[PDB]
């Protein structure tokens, strides 16, 4: 839901007050994605 998937693009296009919102969107997204990966890996490691 951010204006771009690239972080530098947001930084180079917006001022801090709005770049903050966009980066919050990206951070939420990517952090969620990492948690997913780690959980899957925990379970898979249990199987192994």
């Amino acid at each position: 839901g951010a204006i771009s998937s690239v972080l530098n693009d947001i930084l180079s296009r917006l001022d801090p007050p709005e770049a903050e919102v966009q980066i919050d969107r990206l951070i939420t997204g990517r952090l969620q994605s990492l948690q997913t990966y780690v959980t899957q890996q925990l379970i898979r490691a249990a199987e192994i």
Binding site: I3, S12, R13, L14, D15, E18
Partner: protein
């Protein structure tokens, strides 16, 4: 565009294409002639 003598009606809004040139946006955002200068998905300063 800005110093155009006559403007078009909103229903028949004019479109000018800008290409293959250097855009000094300071001339716009440093001008005191504008009541509304609202930029979406971009910060004016960064335009440079």
């Amino acid at each position: 565009v800005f110093n155009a003598t006559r403007f078009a009606s909103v229903y028949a809004w004019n479109r000018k294409r800008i290409s293959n040139c250097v855009a000094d946006y300071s001339v716009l955002y440093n001008s005191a002639s504008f009541s509304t200068f609202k930029c979406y998905g971009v910060s004016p300063t960064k335009l440079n």
